[PDB]
Design a protein around this ligand. Structure first.
Ligand code: THH
Ligand code: NA
Ligand code: NA
Lengths: 304, 304
C-alpha cells in the first residue's frame, strides 16, 4: 500500500491509478508502429482500415473478457500520417489514445491539425513530456487544451530511480517534467520512468513506487522495446519469448504499477491473459492491504 | 529485505533461502504424478526409463542455462511404485528430491524400504510434515535419519498469513509443525504455506513474507495444482496457458519467495525462462540496496 493519497483519473471512462487492487491494470497497445505491415505508406498514413478495425475489435473483446481497460498507442512518422491515424481512431473506437511519435515536430504538427476539439481534450493523451521538451511544444499543448499527458523520465543522464524522480520533480536550475506539463495546462500525469533494458525494469518499477509513494500519480512503463531487443530470448521462439515478455510486463504490476504499454496490439491476446492473472492475485490481497475494489469490472471476478 | 537473518540451506549442492536477490529461485518439477503418461502402472511402478532420463537431462540443461537449481518432486500412489521411482532418481540425477504422495502411508512405506542410507539423508526431502502428521510418520522420518523436510504450514483454521506463526510455533495445547519436525530429527525446514486456488496465491506469498521476516526459513509454494485445474485458461492452448502459468509461478518470487513447485516437468522449458527473467530483474535491484549475490551462477549474469 502506497503512502500518498492516490490520484485516480477518469479518462473518457477509463479509470487509471489508485492503491494496488483498487482498479485493474490499463493496457496500452501500439498501432501504426515502425514496420507495422497493415501500413502500406508510413509517410502518407495509408493502411488497411479493415485490419486496423479488427485489431480495435480484438482489443474491445479482450477488455470485455478480463476487465482490463485499454488506451490505444497511436504512432506516426509524419504529421500527415499521424493526423489521419488519429481521425481513424476517433471514429472507429470510443477508447482514449496516446498521440505518439519519436519526433516532437510530428506530435506538435498533428496537434495543430486537430485544433481546439472537446473530443480531443477528453480522449487524446500527449506522449510525451520528456527531457527534450520545448516552449513551442508546451504552447501547442496549451492551445489544444489537453489535460492528460504521459510524463516520460526516460534519460541516459538519469539511470538510478532517484535521478528519474529529480527529472520529474525538478532539481537545481531545472523545473522538472511535472512543472513543465503544468505550464502547458496538463492537470493529469501518467508517469512513465522509461525502460532502459530488461534487467533495469526493476529500477523502472522502483521509480514508479517512489512516484506513487510521494506524489500519488498513476505509474506505468513500456518494456516492449527492451524485450524485442533481447536477442538471446527472442531467438528461442514461442512460447519462450511470450513467457519472458509476460514476466517483464507483469513485474511492475506485482509492485503496484497502474498501466503497461505492452507493444504491438497483435500481442494483446497473450498480454491480457498474463496481466489479468496478476491483477486477480493482487485484488484478492485487498483485505490484507485495507483496499476496496473501485469497480466490479475486475479480472478477479471475470477470468475464473 | 527481511529483519531475521535468513537460513540458506545447502541440500547436496542446492542453495535455497536468503535475502531476495542473494540466491536464484529453486525450481521443483513433478515426475510420476497421477496421469503422467510415462507411467503405465501406478501400483507396480512401471514407467518409461528413457522418457524419465530425458526429463531429468532436460532439467539439468535448463538449470545450466539459467542458473536456477532444481529439486525433483517424486510422486507415487503405492509403496512399491514410489520405492522404484526414488531408486531410479538416485541413479539417474545428482539433484535432491521430494519424497511425495497424497497418502502418508505411501511415504512411510517407501521410507522403510529406502532405509537410513547416507545418500537418502543428504538428497531425500520429506514432502511433507502437515497439520495431520502422525507419530508413526515422525518415527519413520527419524528411523530414515532425514535432516530436511517441507513444512506444509497450511490449515483452514489459519487462512490468514500471520496464523502461520501459530502452525509453525504451535498455539494452546497444539504442538507446532517445527517442534514436530525437530522431534523427528529434522534440522532444515522448507516452509510451504499451501495454495488453495490461483487468486489466493497472494495470501500464500504474504505467509512466505511473514515466515522470512520473523523466522528466516526458506519460503515457497506449489501453485501448480491451482493452475492445471484452471480449465478456462488451459483449454486456450499455446501461448495463453504458458503466460497465465508464468504470471502465477513468478508472482511469489516478485514478493521474495525462495522456491516454486511448478508441476509437471514437461513445462520446465517455459517455466525456467519465465522464472529466470523475474530473478534477473530482482537481482538487478541489488545494485541499489547493496545485497550481494551468493553465487555467480545467477540468471542476471546468464540469460542476457
Ligand atoms: C498439491 N501439491 C503440492 C503442494 O501444494 N505442496 C507441496 N509441498 N507438495 C505438493 N505436491 C503435489 C502437488 C504439486 N505437484 C503437482 C501439482 C499438479 C499436478 C497436476 O496438475 N497434474 C495434472 C496432469 C498433468 C498431465 O496431464 O500430464 C493433473 O491434472 O493432475 C501434478 C503435480
Ligand atoms: Na488487439
Ligand atoms: Na532466493
Amino acid at each position: 500500500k502506497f503512502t500518498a493519497q492516490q490520484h485516480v483519473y477518469d479518462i473518457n471512462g477509463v479509470k487509471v491509478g489508485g492503491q494496488p487492487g483498487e482498479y485493474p491494470t490499463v493496457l496500452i497497445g501500439s498501432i501504426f508502429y515502425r514496420g507495422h505491415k497493415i501500413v502500406s505508406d508510413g509517410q502518407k498514413g495509408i493502411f488497411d482500415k479493415d485490419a486496423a478495425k479488427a485489431l480495435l475489435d480484438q482489443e474491445a473483446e479482450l477488455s470485455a473478457e478480463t476487465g482490463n481497460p485499454f488506451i490505444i498507442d497511436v504512432l506516426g512518422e509524419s504529421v500527415e500520417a499521424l493526423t489521419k491515424y488519429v481521425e481513424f481512431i476517433l471514429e472507429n473506437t470510443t477508447a482514449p489514445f496516446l498521440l505518439d511519435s519519436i519526433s516532437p515536430d510530428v506530435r506538435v504538427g498533428a496537434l495543430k491539425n486537430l485544433g481546439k476539439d472537446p473530443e480531443i481534450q477528453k480522449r487524446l493523451i500527449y506522449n510525451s513530456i520528456e527531457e527534450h521538451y520545448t516552449e513551442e511544444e508546451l504552447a501547442a499543448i496549451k492551445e489544444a487544451g489537453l489535460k492528460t499527458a504521459v510524463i516520460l523520465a526516460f534519460s541516459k543522464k538519469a539511470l538510478k530511480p532517484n535521478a528519474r524522480i529529480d527529472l520529474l520533480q525538478g532539481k537545481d536550475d531545472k523545473e522538472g517534467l511535472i512543472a513543465a506539463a503544468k505550464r502547458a495546462g496538463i492537470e493529469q500525469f501518467l508517469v512513465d520512468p522509461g525502460v532502459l533494458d530488461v534487467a533495469s525494469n526493476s529500477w523502472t518499477t522502483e521509480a514508479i513506487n517512489v512516484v506513487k509513494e510521494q506524489f500519488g500519480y498513476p505509474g506505468g512503463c513500456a518494456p516492449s522495446a527492451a524485450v524485442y531487443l533481447w536477442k538471446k530470448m527472442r531467438s528461442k521462439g514461442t512460447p519462450f519469448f511470450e513467457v519472458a515478455g509476460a514476466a517483464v510486463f507483469t513485474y511492475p504490476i506485482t509492485q503496484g504499477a497502474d498501466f503497461i504499454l505492452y507493444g504491438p496490439m497483435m500481442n494483446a491476446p497473450w498480454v491480457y491473459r498474463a496481466i489479468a492473472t496478476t491483477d486477480a492475485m493482487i485484488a484478492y490481497n485487498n483485505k490484507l492491504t485495507g483496499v476496496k475494489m473501485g469497480t466490479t469490472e475486475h479480472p478477479l471476478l471475470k477470468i475464473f
